[PDB]
Ligand binder design. Structure first.
Ligand code: ZN
Length: 153
């Protein structure tokens, strides 16, 4: 019941650079509006191969949009989770649309320099993605969410 976990559980929370953190941070000025709509887990700072689901849900979408590259969308009762940029091709994704997943289940295998994790209450993922650079409450801080979720389970 509402379990949470980190995507690379041997590292757990670990540490993030200014650029990797959610929101508007020193080091993130290179992005539009200086806003980062997710949390980046680098292969250096958060080592590991298998990307573990941070929360239970159902896989609603697997697609490709340059920038997100290959991505997986998982929807729970309250949240939409986007796992993006980790997978150099769709063959690196382990799950299929319609699949019920539990916290810790492998989404796929990261073979790029990072996973970007995005979390939103928005149900229309494309609309949320249209707000990738807008600090308007669409996207939530995954670090704070996972941390609080783990503490409260
Ligand atoms: Zn990112």
């Amino acid at each position: 019941k509402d379990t949470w976990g980190w995507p690379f559980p041997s590292v757990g929370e670990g540490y993030f650079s200014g650029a990797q953190l959610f929101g508007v941070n020193p080091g993130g000025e290179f992005r539009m509006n200086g806003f980062h709509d997710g949390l980046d887990f680098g292969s250096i700072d958060h080592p590991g191969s298998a990307v573990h689901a941070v929360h239970s849900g159902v896989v609603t979408q697997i697609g490709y949009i340059a920038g997100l590259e290959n991505y997986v969308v998982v929807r729970s009762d309250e949240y939409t989770f986007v796992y993006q940029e980790a997978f150099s091709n769709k063959g690196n994704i382990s799950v299929k649309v319609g699949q019920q997943i539990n916290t810790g289940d492998v989404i796929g295998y990261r073979d790029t320099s990072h996973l970007h994790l995005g979390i939103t209450r928005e149900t229309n993922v494309m609309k949320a993605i249209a707000n990738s650079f807008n600090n308007n409450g669409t996207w939530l801080d995954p670090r704070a969410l996972i941390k609080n979720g783990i503490a409260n389970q």
